[PDB]
């Protein structure tokens, strides 16, 4: 299975357009210690030519350009993107759909609620009805949007996505409020886990001076602590642990930081845009 992480940041990206926290400020200055990041999205393929897009972020046009895997093939309307899956209806998950409009056939997958919400916005009609097939999917239902690629959505404490091809398994869970034994049982054995890395400490955004809400308040389990994701996930088998959906206020974004080293020392990769996996 081929994986490309198109966007590794949480909503707002890195930097965020109206943020001047210490991390974003480094990015604005073009300091090498902080790599700019687009908003969460990954692409997965069973064969390396036909791809499923997971969520369509506001940065999708930049993501397609930056990643050769996404570049159109020779001829008319010949994109490697065959399907798009929406895991939720948030603006940072659907705004990219407005870019995918120029008569390109693909299949859009989502739950009935999300598809209905999209259809309730006429601006998304740029995905022409005679061009883009809109297909409802149920939770816990396995389907095959690309031949050889099995996809299943499942609830998490909000949905996670289980992707399977050629005996390999990837769990994609960019948003997670808490790690349960139930969740761990689902993840265990996966060749790769891409997991909510929004905040390092519960009070990241407060310390950064950009907000008053804790990670808990916003539905994001923090990385650190006995109750954190790293500790909670440490005793199950996972081929590759990767943090995605990283907020601009997270100090793991700083390339030479102790925090980054600490998270890597505990077996976690901090994702950057264009990171690839061949499982």
CB of 236 to its own copies, least distance (A): 35
36 binds its own copies (CB under 8 A): yes
Interaction pattern, residues 94-133, with its own copies; x per rule: CB under 8 A = xx--xxxxxxx---------------xxxxxxx-------
Residue 1 or 10: which CB sits closer to its own copies?
10
- Residue with Cβ nearer Zn ion (25 or 142): 25
CB of 198 to its own copies, least distance (A): 14
DSSP-based three-state secondary structure for 25: helix
> Distance of alpha carbon 69 from its chain centroid, rounded?
17
Please report whether residue 91 would count as binding its own copies according to CB under 8 A: yes
Residue 7 contacts its own copies per CB under 8 A:
no
Token pair, residue 58, equals: 């506001």
Instruction: Rounding to the nearest 10 degrees, give the CA dihedral for residues 58, 116, 162, 197.
Output: 40
Query: What three-state secondary structure class fits 27?
Result: helix
Nearest residue (CB) to Zn ion, 3 versus 19: 19
Shortest reach from residue 203's CB to its own copies, in Å: 16
Size of the site for its own copies (CB under 8 A): 50
The verdict on 18 binding its own copies (CB under 8 A) reads yes
Instruction: Quote the least distance from Cβ 91 to its own copies, whole Å.
Output: 5
Q: Kindly state the DSSP code that residue 126 receives in the 8-state scheme.
A: G
Contact 249, 16 (CB under 8 A): no
Binding mask 55-74 for its own copies (x = CB under 8 A): ---xxxxx-xx----xxxxx
Can you tell me which residue has the tokens 């969520």? 55
| CB of residue 224 to its own copies, shortest distance in Å | 24
The entry of its own copies, Zn ion, none near residue 255 (CB within 5 to 8 angstroms by kind) is none
Candidates 184, 266, 179, 187; CA nearest to 228 is 179
Under rule CB under 8 A, residue 87 binds its own copies: no
* Chain positions contacting Zn ion, by CB under 5 A: 11, 19, 21, 24, 90, 92, 248
| Residue 276 burial by Cβ neighbours in a 10 Å radius (0-12, 13-18, 19+) | exposed
- Phi, psi angle pair for 162, to nearest 5°: -105, 125
Pairing of strands 2-7, 149-155: unpaired
State the minimum distance, in angstroms, from the CB of residue 72 to Zn ion.
9
Number of residues in the chain? 279
Token digits of residue 241: 């642990």
In angstroms, the CA 274 to CA 37 distance is 10
Residues that bind its own copies (CB under 8 A): 11-13, 15-20, 24, 28, 36, 38, 58-62, 64-65, 70-79, 91, 94-95, 98-104, 120-126, 209-211
């Amino acid at each position: 299975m081929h994986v490309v992480i198109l966007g590794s940041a949480a909503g707002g990206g890195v930097p965020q357009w109206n943020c001047r926290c210490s991390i974003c400020s480094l990015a604005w200055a073009g300091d090498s210690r902080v790599r700019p990041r687009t908003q969460s999205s990954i692409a997965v393929s069973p064969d390396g030519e036909r791809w499923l897009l997971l969520n369509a972020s506001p940065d999708i046009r930049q993501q397609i350009q930056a990643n050769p895997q996404m570049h159109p093939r020779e001829g008319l309307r010949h994109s490697p993107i065959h399907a798009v899956l929406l895991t939720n209806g948030d603006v940072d998950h659907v705004a990219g759909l407005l870019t995918l409009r120029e008569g390109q056939p693909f299949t859009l997958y989502a739950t009935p609620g999300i598809l209905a919400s999209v259809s309730d916005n006429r601006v998304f009609d740029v995905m022409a009805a005679d061009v883009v097939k809109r297909q409802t999917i149920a939770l816990n239902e396995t389907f095959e949007p690309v031949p050889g690629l099995s996809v299943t959505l499942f609830s998490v404490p909000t949905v996670g996505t289980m992707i399977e091809a050629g005996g390999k398994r990837l769990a994609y869970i960019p948003g997670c409020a808490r790690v349960t034994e139930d969740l761990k049982a689902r993840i265990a054995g996966a060749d790769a886990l891409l997991f909510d890395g929004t905040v390092l400490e519960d009070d990241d955004m407060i310390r950064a001076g950009v907000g008053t809400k804790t990670g808990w308040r916003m539905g994001h389990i923090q990385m650190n602590g006995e109750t954190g994701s790293i500790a909670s996930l440490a005793d199950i088998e996972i081929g590759r642990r990767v943090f995605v959906h990283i907020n601009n206020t997270n100090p793991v974004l700083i390339e030479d930081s102790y925090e980054r080293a600490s998270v890597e020392a505990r077996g976690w990769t901090v994702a950057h845009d264009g990171l690839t996996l061949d499982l």
